[PDB]
Amino acid sequence: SKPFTLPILTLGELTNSRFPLPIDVLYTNPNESAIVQCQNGRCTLDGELQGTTQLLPTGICAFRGKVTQQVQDEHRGTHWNMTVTNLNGTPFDPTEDVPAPLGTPDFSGQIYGVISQRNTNTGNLPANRAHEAVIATYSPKFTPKLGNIQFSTWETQDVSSGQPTKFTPVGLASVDANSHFDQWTLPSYSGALTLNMNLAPSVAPVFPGECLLFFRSFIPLKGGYGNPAIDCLMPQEWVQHLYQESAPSLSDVALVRYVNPETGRTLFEAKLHRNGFLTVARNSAGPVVAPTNGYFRFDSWVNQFYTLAPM
Amino acid sequence: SKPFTLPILTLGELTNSRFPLPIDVLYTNPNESAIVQCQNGRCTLDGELQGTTQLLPTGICAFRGKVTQQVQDEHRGTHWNMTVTNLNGTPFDPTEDVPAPLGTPDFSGQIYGVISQRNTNLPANRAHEAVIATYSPKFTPKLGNIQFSTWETQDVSSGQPTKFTPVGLASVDANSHFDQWTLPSYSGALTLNMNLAPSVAPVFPGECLLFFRSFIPLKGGYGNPAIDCLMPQEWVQHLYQESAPSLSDVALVRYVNPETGRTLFEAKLHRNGFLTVARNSAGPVVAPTNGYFRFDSWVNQFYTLAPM
Numbered sequence A: 001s002k003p004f005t006l007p008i009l010t011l012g013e014l015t016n017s018r019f020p021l022p023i024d025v026l027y028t029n030p031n032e033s034a035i036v037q038c039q040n041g042r043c044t045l046d047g048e049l050q051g052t053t054q055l056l057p058t059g060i061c062a063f064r065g066k067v068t069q070q071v072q073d074e075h076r077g078t079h080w081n082m083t084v085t086n087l088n089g090t091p092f093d094p095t096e097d098v099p100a101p102l103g104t105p106d107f108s109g110q111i112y113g114v115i116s117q118r119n120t121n122t123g124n125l126p127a128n129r130a131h132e133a134v135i136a137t138y139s140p141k142f143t144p145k146l147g148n149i150q151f152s153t154w155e156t157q158d159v160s161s162g163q164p165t166k167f168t169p170v171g172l173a174s175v176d177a178n179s180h181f182d183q184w185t186l187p188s189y190s191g192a193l194t195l196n197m198n199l200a201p202s203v204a205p206v207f208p209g210e211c212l213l214f215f216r217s218f219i220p221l222k223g224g225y226g227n228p229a230i231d232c233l234m235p236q237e238w239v240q241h242l243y244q245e246s247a248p249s250l251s252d253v254a255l256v257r258y259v260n261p262e263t264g265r266t267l268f269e270a271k272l273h274r275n276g277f278l279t280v281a282r283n284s285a286g287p288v289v290a291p292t293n294g295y296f297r298f299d300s301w302v303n304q305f306y307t308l309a310p311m
Numbered sequence B: 001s002k003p004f005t006l007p008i009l010t011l012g013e014l015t016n017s018r019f020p021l022p023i024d025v026l027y028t029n030p031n032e033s034a035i036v037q038c039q040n041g042r043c044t045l046d047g048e049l050q051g052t053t054q055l056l057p058t059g060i061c062a063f064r065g066k067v068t069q070q071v072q073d074e075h076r077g078t079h080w081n082m083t084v085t086n087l088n089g090t091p092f093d094p095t096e097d098v099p100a101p102l103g104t105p106d107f108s109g110q111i112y113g114v115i116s117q118r119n120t121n122l123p124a125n126r127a128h129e130a131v132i133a134t135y136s137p138k139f140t141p142k143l144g145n146i147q148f149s150t151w152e153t154q155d156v157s158s159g160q161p162t163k164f165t166p167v168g169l170a171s172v173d174a175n176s177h178f179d180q181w182t183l184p185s186y187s188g189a190l191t192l193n194m195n196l197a198p199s200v201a202p203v204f205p206g207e208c209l210l211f212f213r214s215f216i217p218l219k220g221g222y223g224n225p226a227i228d229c230l231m232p233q234e235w236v237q238h239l240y241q242e243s244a245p246s247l248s249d250v251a252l253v254r255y256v257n258p259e260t261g262r263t264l265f266e267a268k269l270h271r272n273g274f275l276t277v278a279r280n281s282a283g284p285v286v287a288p289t290n291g292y293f294r295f296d297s298w299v300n301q302f303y304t305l306a307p308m
Ligand SMILES: C[C@@H]1O[C@H](O)[C@@H](O)[C@H](O)[C@@H]1O
Pocket: A127, A128, A129, A158, B219, B220, B221, B222
């Protein structure tokens, strides 16, 4: 049986699996009342991708497809419908047992980015354009599981119908009350009033005094006040690593130690659960203040009854 | 001796190490006249990062720093002087043995992206489209400062933390000086670049470089620009982790169809971290994107590759 391992990347060498951002800090929030059930950055310890998780850092909260037409929307700006395909360009098959095309955003909010187009038709070179764009994942028109979504632009005219279109995510447009940013609220992938399907399962601590440990990134804002963050269960590099090592899980829980390679000391220990998330024995909310050269080291397989040293 | 390996990621599971793009195709161009000496996506087979190469996919062609001054363009647009730090926020030390801050773009062109700011003193935020002309005399990242330009005329704040997220190219018109193999002058035009990753080339007759190619978006105009990297970012990350000793100067690798188990072609993976093939034509390699490279054995510079 192939031994389980984690990459030896330090915190400053990791990226978020839920938005294309570096990992900034480790973070806890024991009193979180929301159900934690994100769909990107989901991978079992034996390498099974779940939810909408795919391997490309460039695919996270990305879309590929074609603009169909400008559409009316009550909300501010100029709005456009685009059909979406799989990120590799093949048609998205709604009958596949996934919640939405892989890479689809997994939270409620106004996602800010750039829409770019390279025309199909044509020194036999195609015309191009790109503009800032916003995708409101809470919108009734956000229906990626049905193969189309809507985005809005400040630009009023220069978006072409029927041309190949890419959305590159950059941040959030706003986190004001009317922008409905909630990182733990899933979009309705098939539209308002419809049930999401094929979801990766919720995660939670199952042991007294333990709480989830997140890899947190701060996400840029187009405007307004705020310091929004996106918390992922494991960084994208871990998803990539686990996926290639398909190492058998020898118990439900791995014991991992956060180590300072400079000093050799263990800063704290954590449970790495089979479904792909971490818990720690910590009684507070907020960042874990530790050097970013720290990294998690796999120690051994333990079980649900193992008591973690308090952080 | 730790065995050399490559990740088992397929083409459709790889990303470019020189720009944040997925790999679209493998590609050759035997008649290329330029010296190939890119500085991102550079890593030896035994895990030594070189040039401006760093591990984060988010760091490639990224900048971090603070705006110091607004300067209007003579014709159109607004320019902003920016001091740059290391991507991890620590001050960039120009005496470090690197060409420029890690992640600095490694080619001539107008790089299009978004500048975003989150103030220090809840904080205020703003973002706008921006262009960094890497051929500009004001592009001097090794000296710790660059300039970017905006369509926005006023709403960029001085003395506030600033992030550049690259998206594509502004233009590939003649006056936009896009040339993926022309390095920026990291310290300005009269100064020599330093600490560079070495140039790469075939040393054997009938061989040519094999690239991992991505098509890069354009803000406007005509074109279908591409960026070619020597190895995808996932290979850089893998080699750095493994640090497997290199047992000869050349590894022999096979591009395999996992469905059929058959080898489609073979290539030389050179110690300095680049591929060559025996191919006498230019253009994409037509192969399924579930194909992947598998390490076969160590060979040498005199090994004759099976023609593609
Ligand atoms: C070639 C032209 O480039 C401009 O920048 C674009 O705004 C137009 O849509 C068109 O593609």
